[PDB]
Amino acid sequence: AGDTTITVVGNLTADPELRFTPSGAAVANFTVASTPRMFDRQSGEWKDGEALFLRCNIWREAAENVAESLTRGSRVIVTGRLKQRSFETREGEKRTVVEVEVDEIGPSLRYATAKVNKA
Amino acid sequence: GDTTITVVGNLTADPELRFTPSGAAVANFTVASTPRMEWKDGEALFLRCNIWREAAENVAESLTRGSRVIVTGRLKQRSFETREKRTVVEVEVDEIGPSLRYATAKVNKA
Amino acid sequence: GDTTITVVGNLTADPELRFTPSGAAVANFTVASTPRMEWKDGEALFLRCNIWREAAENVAESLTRGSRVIVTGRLKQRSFETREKRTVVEVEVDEIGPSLRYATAKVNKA
Amino acid sequence: AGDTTITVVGNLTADPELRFTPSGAAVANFTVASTPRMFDRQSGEWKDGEALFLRCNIWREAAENVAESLTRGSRVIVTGRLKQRSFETREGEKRTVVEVEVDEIGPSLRYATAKVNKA
Incomplete structure (x- = not known):
């Protein structure tokens, strides 16, 4: 009844890639780079942690809006x-990767403002 | 050990921006989350939210x-323990953005 | 569209098991979540929880x-809108288990 | 300040693998198989969705308790x-995989009871 759900905050590594299926349905893909932060004890300020890169998919109107x-x-x-x-390597094997099927997405207002226009 | 939450919904009212006596910007708003499954609204959930600093002004x-x-x-x-027991909740906002599910946005850094 | 939450904490009291007039098992308990960072407890957060069916009995x-x-x-x-405005929250539990952070458990299916 | 956090419910695919680092610190690894469920319209009851398999890591006392x-x-x-x-293929390349660094874990009481013993 419950899917495995997630919230990620981060930056897009590139402009969203927009495609259209043969039926005309839009699909956008992009990757979120999420930079965590540790305390870094033993003197010193903050220190960025290893970034997590998650490939995200989104469909139809929401993809167009993205x-x-x-x-x-x-x-x-x-x-x-x-x-x-599931994917396919040039050596025959099927290697899987975890992606986010996006439910909702929006630009953070942390360091930016936005002019919102409702459909 | 902090309990985190993600909520999606609509502001019940325009955000109220103030400045502490110190000069720090703070914004208060309430998010109304009304689940649906164009048939049958669920219970409506209204979460008071506060956010600080530049984010407050951008909101x-x-x-x-x-x-x-x-x-x-x-x-x-x-809990306001009393004459009589009263509780409220609130979300200390880490991040917030307008959803692009049903809208577009022109975004402007800084 | 449902707002979900995960909470980690300690039961404030033994779970209270009842049966609806229908015969359905229900358990009520409250989770006290006290964040720490062995220095400085944070605010304590007490979430009323309800769960149903076999899970209720297992709890x-x-x-x-x-x-x-x-x-x-x-x-x-x-919201109990009134003589005077009163709100409570509650978690409709999907799953629950005892944490193995500071404990072991002998588990027995069914 | 915020890491990307997750909650998963599922079954272990195998007994937890327990190891000890050279320092004596315990590490346990295991994979959670999370089976989502769709409505399956066009007549018919439920239908199990594609399972998600997430490799999980946990350390020290908590690993021993697991x-x-x-x-x-x-x-x-x-x-x-x-x-x-990051990993290493037999063809030279470095392929990444997403795993869960476990904060807390416990047996679900959905279909089981547990005798809990506190440390």
Whole structure:
């Protein structure tokens, strides 16, 4: 009844890639780079932790809205479901990767303002 | 050890921006989350939210009554123990953004 | 569209097991979540929880006052609008288990 | 300040693998198989969705407690942080995978009871 759900905050590594299926349905893909931060004891200020890079998918109107509104570097908040997709290596094997099927996404207002236009 | 929460919903009213006596910007708003499954609204959940600093000012400039938002933060609770027991909750907002589910946005850094 | 929450904390009291007039088992318990960072407790957050069916009976059999638990469920809110405004929250528990952070458990299916 | 956090519910695919670092610190690894469920419209009851398999890591006392308490098939609830680890293929390349650094874990009481013993 419950999918595995997630919230990620981070920046897009690149402009959202927008495609259209053969039916005309829009799909946008992008990756969120999430930079955590540790205390870094033994003197010293903060220290950025290893970044997590999550590939995200989103469909139809929401995908179009993402393509119209976000770009490389955009700081975003994303909620969605973690899904495992299967791929194919040039050596025959099927290696999986975890991606986010996005439910909702928006630009963070932490360091930015936004002019919102409702559909 | 902090209990975190993500809520999606609509501002019940325009964010109220103030400044502490110290000069620090603070914004208060309430998120109304009404689940649906175009048939049958669920119970409506109204979460009081507070946020600070530049984010506070960006919220006040960018969002209004009705704006659909994604909010993540820490869930807080108070009890006013009394004459009579009263509790409220509140979310100390870490990040907030307008949802692009049903809208577009022109974004402007800094 | 449902707002979910995960909370980690300790039962304030032994779970209270009842049966609806229908015969359905229900358990009520409250989770006290006290964040720490062995220096400085944070604010304590007490979430009323309800769960149903076999899970209700397993909770009542397995957990007591003090038991450290991991709880995920849907956050619910009520307003008692009145003579005077009063709200409470509650978590409709999807799953619950005792944490193995500071304890072991002998587990027994069914 | 915020890591990317997650809650997963599922079953262990196998008994937890327990190891000890050269310092004597315990580490347990295991994978949670999370089976979501869709409505399956166009007549028909429920239908299990594609399972998500997440590799989980946990350390020290908590790892020992997991090894003492859980086995293959154990239904569990897990909270933790999503981390990307780097590996090495037999063809030279470094392929990453997302894992859970476990904060807390416990056996679900959904279909089971537990005798809890506090340390």
